[PDB]
Design an enzyme around this catalytic site. Sequence first.
Site, PDB file in Angstrom:
ATOM      1  N   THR B   1     -20.187   0.073 -12.773  1.00  0.00           N
ATOM      2  CA  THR B   1     -19.831   1.420 -12.347  1.00  0.00           C
ATOM      3  C   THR B   1     -19.623   1.477 -10.839  1.00  0.00           C
ATOM      4  O   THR B   1     -20.489   1.069 -10.068  1.00  0.00           O
ATOM      5  CB  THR B   1     -20.909   2.442 -12.750  1.00  0.00           C
ATOM      6  OG1 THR B   1     -21.074   2.429 -14.173  1.00  0.00           O
ATOM      7  CG2 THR B   1     -20.512   3.841 -12.303  1.00  0.00           C
ATOM      8  N   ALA B  49     -25.798   9.078 -17.894  1.00  0.00           N
ATOM      9  CA  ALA B  49     -24.567   9.591 -18.485  1.00  0.00           C
ATOM     10  C   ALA B  49     -24.724  11.050 -18.894  1.00  0.00           C
ATOM     11  O   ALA B  49     -23.986  11.925 -18.426  1.00  0.00           O
ATOM     12  CB  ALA B  49     -24.164   8.727 -19.680  1.00  0.00           C
TER      13      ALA B  49
END
Lengths: 198, 212, 66, 222, 241, 233, 242, 244, 250
Positions: B1, B49
């Site tokens: 990420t 998330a």
Amino acid sequence: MDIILGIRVQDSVILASSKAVTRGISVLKDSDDKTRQLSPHTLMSFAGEAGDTVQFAEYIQANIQLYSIREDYELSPQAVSSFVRQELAKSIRSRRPYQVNVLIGGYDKKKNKPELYQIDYLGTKVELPYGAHGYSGFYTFSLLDHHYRPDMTTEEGLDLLKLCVQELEKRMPMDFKGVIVKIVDKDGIRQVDDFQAQ
Amino acid sequence: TTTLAFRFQGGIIVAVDSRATAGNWVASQTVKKVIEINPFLLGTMAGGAADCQFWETWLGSQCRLHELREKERISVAAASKILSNLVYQYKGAGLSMGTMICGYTRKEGPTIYYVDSDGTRLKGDIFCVGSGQTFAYGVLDSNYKWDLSVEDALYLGKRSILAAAHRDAYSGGSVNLYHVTEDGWIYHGNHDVGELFWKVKEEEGSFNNVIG
Amino acid sequence: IRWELISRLCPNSTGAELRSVCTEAGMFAIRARRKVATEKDFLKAVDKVISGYKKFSSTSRYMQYN
Amino acid sequence: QFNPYGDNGGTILGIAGEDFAVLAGDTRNITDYSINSRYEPKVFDCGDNIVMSANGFAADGDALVKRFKNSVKWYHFDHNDKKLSINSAARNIQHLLYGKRFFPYYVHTIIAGLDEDGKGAVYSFDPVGSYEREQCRAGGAAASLIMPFLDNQVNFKNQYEPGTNGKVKKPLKYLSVEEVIKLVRDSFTSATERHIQVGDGLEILIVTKDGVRKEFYELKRD
Amino acid sequence: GYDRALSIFSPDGHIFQVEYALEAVKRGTCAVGVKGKNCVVLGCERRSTLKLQDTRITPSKVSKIDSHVVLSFSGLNADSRILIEKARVEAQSHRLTLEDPVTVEYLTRYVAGVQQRYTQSGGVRPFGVSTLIAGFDPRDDEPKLYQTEPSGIYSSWSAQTIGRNSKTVREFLEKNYDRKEPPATVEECVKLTVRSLLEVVQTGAKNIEITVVKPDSDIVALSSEEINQYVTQIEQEKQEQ
Amino acid sequence: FRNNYDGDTVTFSPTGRLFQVEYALEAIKQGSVTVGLRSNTHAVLVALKRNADELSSYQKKIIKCDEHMGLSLAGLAPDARVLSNYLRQQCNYSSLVFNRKLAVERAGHLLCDKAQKNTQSYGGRPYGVGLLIIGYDKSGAHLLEFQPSGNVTELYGTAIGARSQGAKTYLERTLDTFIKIDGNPDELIKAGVEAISQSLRDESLTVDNLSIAIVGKDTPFTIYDGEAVAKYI
Amino acid sequence: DRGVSTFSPEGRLFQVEYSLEAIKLGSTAIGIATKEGVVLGVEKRATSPLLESDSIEKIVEIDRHIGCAMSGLTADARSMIEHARTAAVTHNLYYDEDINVESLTQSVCDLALRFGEGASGEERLMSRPFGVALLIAGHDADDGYQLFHAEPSGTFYRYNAKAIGSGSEGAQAELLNEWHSSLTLKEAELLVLKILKQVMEEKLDENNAQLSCITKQDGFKIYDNEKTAELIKELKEKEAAE
Amino acid sequence: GSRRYDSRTTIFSPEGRLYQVEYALESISHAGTAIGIMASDGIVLAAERKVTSTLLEQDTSTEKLYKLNDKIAVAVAGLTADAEILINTARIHAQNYLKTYNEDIPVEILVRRLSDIKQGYTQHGGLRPFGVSFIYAGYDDRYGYQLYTSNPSGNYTGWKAISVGANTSAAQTLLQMDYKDDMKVDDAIELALKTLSKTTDSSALTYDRLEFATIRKGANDGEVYQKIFKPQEIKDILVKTGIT
Amino acid sequence: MTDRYSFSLTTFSPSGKLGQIDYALTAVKQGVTSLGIKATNGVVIATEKKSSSPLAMSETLSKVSLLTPDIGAVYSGMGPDYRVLVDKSRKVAHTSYKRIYGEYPPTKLLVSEVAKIMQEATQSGGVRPFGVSLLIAGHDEFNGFSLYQVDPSGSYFPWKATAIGKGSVAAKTFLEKRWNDELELEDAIHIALLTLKESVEGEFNGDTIELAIIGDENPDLLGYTGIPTDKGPRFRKLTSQEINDRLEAL
């Protein structure tokens, strides 16, 4: 943890704060400033763990502004120091403590003499002409016990601040990415961008 | 990420990978790490998330309420600060979050704000968070320029995310670009790194250490 | 004259108040020496009677008894 | 101390077609090391041609299914029996999954259905409470055996035209219901012997315009 | 504790408590406000029944809510400063939550909302005050004048007056003030406000207080030695023409 | 007119009646006709909706709380929302805790227990709403008649509303008839439509005036409206 | 006074009986439902010429697709409007879709029956029912353009053409024969202006009445002063035709 | 039903004023008179206790003047019982202010706190309003000497000379003529004593029923001396004023 | 459910006087005529026990009670109200001083604290004012002997000599000449006995008189020996035998 410094002369008080924000392993922003103007004649400089800093500073700023607008009269810096030390005292025993090592300084209208107080994260009120928090103190108290005078002026106090900042940048592995110098006097609040060589 | 965003004279550009990893094994490659709150401001995925996704979707409620109440668009500062406060009152509960609040205003122009689970709110120009944010921070600053045109900014961001994802294990997948203007964000398109790395290596010649 | 407009601008007033409105409308023309009362006179009269003499109204207490 | 969480085995898999969607999962539930039962369906019809299967804690999955069905009933009641879109169901589940943070549901669930345009959609939900639009993905500890196999015959990844020396990608094609059901059957028949908690039959659900059809296929019982 | 409803719909449709609060306001001191191109002036009078009231510690009739927005009231003075306190704390909270200095419209909406809630909640009588809100929005030079009624209805007025004999001041403003052509100077606004006051106050230059609000965080309170200065030429121009 | 003993609900008349409850029942009477009836295997509700003017709409006098139950309205509309919500809460609780579909008699008992606690304590007011619960459980088709007084009884058929009780005679004359009718929903609905027609006074039945619901084993609870009801007109 | 939530021998509750007639003390709001959208218009009624036209806003937007008018006493509807906006936005957040207009109206009308003393079983507080009636208008993807009537009694109707307030009896009568299923948005605006002119107190202009519209593509929109003025001119041309 | 026994304390009259505070303002007039004079050098608070007899204790007895802080003192006119709770709350608030700011509480803050306490009951709760009005005196570096007054309505104004209680009008008229802007403490004291002599309902003026509180500032600067005049010193000023 | 009487039951009359307060004063002025006077070396508080039925036991009923071993209480109003008042006052005195300061509060602060309860009763809604008038006598090492009278309104006044009840007017108008600056405890008790003689209407003996004295710290009733800091309780109450000895001393 960051670098926060403060020096009071017979004429005014000068606040110094590091511009570095060390989170994780990278530097998010090296031009940041950690200061709050509670009153036109009072400055607020904060340090400590970044989770609690800004919102707590805004909380005290809100209370001070609310009092100043309800009474149309400026609180003494001693009163503001008492206020913030009460907040720390009532907060550290709470479920979620506020660990913010803070500096309070400003000019007083009643006695016509600026004052500077140091508050730790535990809520201790002390009256010192100069002070520092965290790892920056060791190189500031030692140097300022030699050249600081009770009768100096702001201009050569700036030179003393240059010597202190040089000591920090020489003996700190942590780089503060320079400092922002703001003077507090009867005239108001002024920002000085000269810290390296004056 | 690896999520990055920067500022220039034309608008706001964000470039985020689409690789979501479940520990060692990469959970997914088609995830969307940008949350379209409304066609004015932006949002990014970093850390938890669900934690980021829910609250960033929750942001759109506050924007609509403020717009209907004041008959005017909510400023970026308030949009960042409400999430900052909401995270602050939830600190210590295990929330881990990271996001970029990217918005464009009339009086204040383009503004980028940083908000994390720690509760820190920051104002600046160069921001990048994720697992390989460091692998990106070594690219944009060297080639940063205030007068970069839209195409140059897009290519710079795409190259930065390509470099970050090439080395970072949890960064990769398709590349999404977003341009923020007075109207708001405009979707540029999907960019799979398969047709990107080879074209960059053949054209520019970078990544010389790579064989082939 | 617009009788519909005058009737509309007089909600929940008993017929005695309408009679008093007519009397005051007639009176206001006399004080101005005009021999004909117009709509502008009736509007002033209805404002004065319904609105001005509202604290001394009976149809709001006795309705509860009914 | 006490462990409020646990494992029960089982695997799920959902594939989104063009005008349809398929959800498949094994009927085997286990505890610790032995087979608990043979015929334990994990895929349930939620109504309005919407299906979803929960992989993870059996109690958590059953509770999520029951509360989602209750939410669907309430939405039908208050909205004058308005049809439930798959996106609305996904967001409602996300809200349900974010119901409490201190005690998250450690269940991986996948929904399937059709959008307002009749296009197949599949959403995978993280136990933390996150979801995303997706074509195909499996769930549970058996996902590692199944998900990379889907990219071969669905996304056609890392596969190039013969004779083009690898410079040309294969054009994507849309598979029929028979194609996807045979793909999933092969996938599970490959997974059953390579993963201990996979087997005891297969339940696969097909979502189409006409409705929902139930198909069962026996697997290795070992 | 007290849950009994105090505001009950009358058989004729009005709320008796609200329409009684209207009269309670009608007995208050007259307060008037006008706005120019870039200046808004809030004029007010004081009670002359009793004397020997000093000026320094006497609570000002016009209370400063923030540096850019000020409030003036009429009617029951006891209840109005509670609204002042609530408005001030709400303004500080708005600064904390939105990182923006409060606007006149939002503050007036909040005041109307709290008065509406007190007309709604049980066991509480409605406020007996009527408030005037004036000030300048941040980065905007346009003066905004707002009136809030105890019933909860708020509206913008180019020039509005409240309190006793407000009808006379209203009709005076209806002919010596032009909505489409506002006075262009602070002096003209002050002169209009003063001349409006003598129509009712009828002597009392000592207890006539006027606050002038200017943009860029400028709020001033004209002292007596300037108000009588304006009164001098106003009365000079009155009788000779 | 109102008397001294009206006051609040917690007050007894010297005769020994509650004037609040009586006023609630009168408001029940003032509402429209919603005659309903049941057979051994079917339950039929027939409702006559009311429109304010020509350019107006019609109230949903048939509210569904589950697939095996239904509601009808004969009074105050807003309190019907509260009553239906409570019935739905209990039905969902039964589904989620017992798996057993709520028994019709149990639903009536819950409804009366709810309706009591306003008339028993100060601060509450009786529910001026009249429910005709229908449903079908393992025992058989059932029908109830709820009242604001808390009285709940099970009947083959009834009619609550303005001059609706004048249509009870049609049911009574044919009480021996529609009972022996099983698995014949359309003709039972036709008999119900004949029953309501006896309560008409000014205007006849049209497409937008007839709202019909029916429940059973092969026939789940379904609400008929619009063109779907014209076949039974 | 005696009783608050007390019934009556006629069987209708008090307060709401008074509130149902307290709307006539307010302004006149008129809406017309057409297949091309819904046109809303109100009566500003500036008590003095020193009032500002853009000051008093009797038309609000609950959502881009749903807007409402106002009548009766305005202040009470602020709680109504806040709750309606909160409900719409929360439904959007929960279900990633616009809230159906009928469902939103239902979620609004339930608040009109909360007056009572010492609520038992849950914490809900209210002294008197709201005395304001609203005209909910909007578009949906299932039915289309809707126009409701949020009565203070908790009941609501779908309405093709409604007038509430002072003209609730005068203007409403004309709407019976002046409305048809083939009405266009332009002619709907013309008819609304004509009916307002018939029910006008003073001369009608862009400063005395404010109009709005709802559409499937443009959504909710408040009509500007210039378009209102040209609409007034068009109505002036239309009225004196023969 | 618990309605017929309610009196509706917080209800607006048909013309539009409250009725309970209206009768509280009558109850005030039936209490003992108090006087407050603002002098340049200090503030003098005096009050005449009502219901006096030979058996009334005077050695240690203060019922009209109360101490809230070393710098701030108040005068009570009305029901002493209801005044006790207000006095306690004021003292608590002043000590909390010293807790929060570690600086002497200004008079205006305490005056607001007490006015808010009264207003809260006059607004909601359905309880009878406090039937007491205070006279506040104190010193600070903000505005120097301060002399406010309170009301059951909860409104406060500044005054250079006030007298709340019985025969308020007569006392005000008497003091307004003799009030200048330049008295010392002694001139204000003798003026107050003459006013009390001319407003009392008895014949003579004996030291038993008079109470005095004075604020003085001498050699020490920044701190005033608060002395409650005891009867031994009270009987002294009687001969100085000539009343004896 | 709870308490629906949240509204104040004391409402200002248009004449400007409290109803319930002026009503409790009337309820007090009728009843048992009690009295108490203060002397230099002590305070004597006396009351007469009106034996309702001659089959009852006046010993069980305590007309006077012990707030603290230094401070006693005498009332002249309604029995049960005084009992509840004395229990509550003992509890709050313990809570305020024994828990926090460690000793027994002086008379001046205890009287204000107990009057707090009554001045709250006339304020808190749904309750009626106490129908009793309290005579509080006590001593302390700084303010010395002091006697306080508490009225149902909550107002307390320091009085050297007092009397409340039916014979209040006669006793009050008779105590001025009886009392002077210097007094003795036996002189004070003789004064009290002479004053109460005419105000009694029943049989006169030691059983019908309830009498208590606050004097020097007697160590016999202390209940322990060995601590020079404390010398015993100053509050003692005469039995019937004790009082029927000075009864014939008239």
